[PDB]
Symmetry: D2
Subunit: 221 residues, 4 copies
């Protein structure tokens, strides 16, 4: 039995997180608008929808931001076989996104299982939302720096020195109010099955908040 990891398994509930491999370069090459591009974001949400619709697996919902998607699973696919789940889902995502962006050169996602207790499920997504936000700010800050005639290394360097408030200040000065930028850039996008139509929510609440908590709770059941 040389296929030693082909037995490794998991238990419900689990979260599959797939992240685009080397997407910084691969998206710089093709000429995507920076720091955000609604075509790419729509491609990713459409990828998630297509997964929920035609993968033959049954996630409760997907949450996507940046170059990554997370699928909540209660019903485990492939008997919980980690290799099979990770590989198949990553492959399907690669194919789907390749279709949706009409790519001429191949791309790849990485995938990983996150084992969780049910009670922990909101926190995880909260964490992820936070990360999304932390991308948002940085993504714009960085941009502004490059627009002010800065080198890449210098921009990263300076970007580390100042914290979120100072970045807000810098961006607000130059005409960019981060609070009025679209919801999906700072909070991400939810894709879920409802009573059955698959719907994309592009205006989701902040998870750890008054409207966010029952929202997530209703998503999870």
């Amino acid at each position: 039995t040389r296929e030693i990891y082909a037995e490794m398994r998991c238990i419900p509930p689990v979260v599959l997180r797939a992240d685009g491999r080397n997407f910084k370069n691969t998206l710089s090459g093709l000429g995507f608008e920076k720091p955000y591009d609604k075509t790419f974001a729509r491609a990713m949400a459409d990828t998630a929808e297509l997964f929920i619709k035609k993968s033959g697996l049954s996630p409760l919902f997907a949450y996507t931001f940046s170059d990554e998607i997370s699928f909540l699973f209660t019903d485990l696919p492939f008997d919980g076989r980690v290799e099979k789940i990770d590989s198949v889902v990553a492959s399907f995502l690669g194919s789907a996104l390749t279709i949706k962006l009409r790519l001429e050169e191949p791309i790849a996602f990485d995938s990983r299982l996150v084992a969780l207790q049910k009670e922990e499920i909101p926190e995880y997504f909260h964490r992820r939302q936070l990360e999304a936000w932390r991308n948002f700010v940085a993504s714009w800050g960085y941009y502004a720096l490059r627009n002010e005639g800065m080198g890449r290394n210098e921009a990263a360097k300076y970007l580390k020195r100042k914290k979120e408030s100072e970045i807000h200040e810098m961006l607000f000065e130059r005409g960019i109010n981060l609070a009025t930028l679209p919801s999906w850039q700072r909070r991400g996008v939810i894709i879920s099955k409802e009573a059955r139509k698959i719907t994309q929510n592009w205006e989701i609440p902040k998870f750890k908040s008054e409207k966010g908590i029952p929202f997530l709770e209703k998503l999870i059941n």
Copy 2:
């Protein structure tokens, strides 16, 4: 650290085997010739070549047949991390094949690592070649049945009941001598870097045989 399998690793030498998931249905739509179609076989060999060419990983070679490819790895990618290797390679394969076949609907590979001792490396491929043969015959048997007015299930029962000799005889009666068919249908295709151009060998020797042994031995180093 909820990402429990994200640290799990392997050791050289390893073989990554990716197998097309449910390729029967998802690819049936376009009308590929049955039981073998050089357009699909060329697509798979092209996928393997493209992997060797632009993945940024370094397999020694690929061996492909049916809907599957095996990559020999001595230099392990991603520090030998099983999740990352399986997911990323499967994903890249999905993307590549989606490009080469210009697919409108998404597909997926499953992937798995096969842990091996160097001494076992030839045997594995021999095993795989054997499987290829077992595919070959079977693939034709079924086909013949379809031309002779058979139900799919009807085709399954008989095919399971009789062994290779009687099947060979049937195919010869129904007009098909398997010995006149091209080498790659029964032996598969090798993709490797040679004297340096990446080359597809569509006329490979039987691995466990007098000309096959030094061939494989030179492939592996």
Copy 3:
């Protein structure tokens, strides 16, 4: 990094189940009373108590029956490292039991992690209790058969043919009422820390029952 499984981890809550290796033979040899021996049972409960008291790990409680002990863990030891947890706990159990039975020849436990959702924790132990019961009956039936001048193989053979009721009948006929045999033989023994004194309960309720449910619920918190 040749120590590939040294990274494999888990998440709370988990149950460690250790089972005496080849204990049938090893206990037949030393001359333990069959089918139950309160000296061995006391040794096992004392082993569990000693584990809770001096292992330096922190299970919520242990449940023991036959040649096996299960430890409920909420606080995970050794960062959840499966190898380290299994090996260390198995080793400690071997040592402890070796002390308590004053053994001249070495013994071993096997160990395994059971990954569970909190909501599933009662069911598991219920399952185990059921198994305990299924041992109980069989253990006596078997005994009776050997007492009626039967060979081992014949006794097992016949034992499979009849179900629990018929066994109850057989044993009740020969003077043995299974309902009046001690609680620990049919329900097992609980060992837990209380507000801190470690106490052994040798008269536990049936878990799936009116008195059993709040009992287990109070054990788990």
Copy 4:
């Protein structure tokens, strides 16, 4: 199937390394000679011998030093199941050592599988022997410090600061020439079946050396 790691396996050749857990404290009570004690070393070699003799498993040989033993396995026990192998072997070792030292308080080993290519097998043991040496020197350094009126922490600081030459010099000044000490303290002990009696070699060659190479090579076959 909540027992998710219970299927995880490995491939030959493998090395099981068991290391005494917290042996500093738990064994300190009896008053073992420091920094080395032939009673404990004999106990460990006896444990390895007893394992080879009555475990029912079949290692090729054991190598032991300090509080640790390594077993070379080509024939894998328990179908190569990692949980079962680690837990059972660790447990047996705990029991055996508990018997040979006649302990009143329980002890534990941790265990781990080391996956190796045959070509790597000597190197591993070389590495281990190196570790043995690094133990040896250090073990004495500390000791000397204790005789020269040092705090434990005080002993740690200096010992970390200086490298082997200066330490050698210190020990020579404080009366101890390490070259006159017995071979096993710096090289460890081998336990293997020989011409067939199970034998303990307490005078083994340096593994990576002219006489060591054919020695190890004959041990491994």
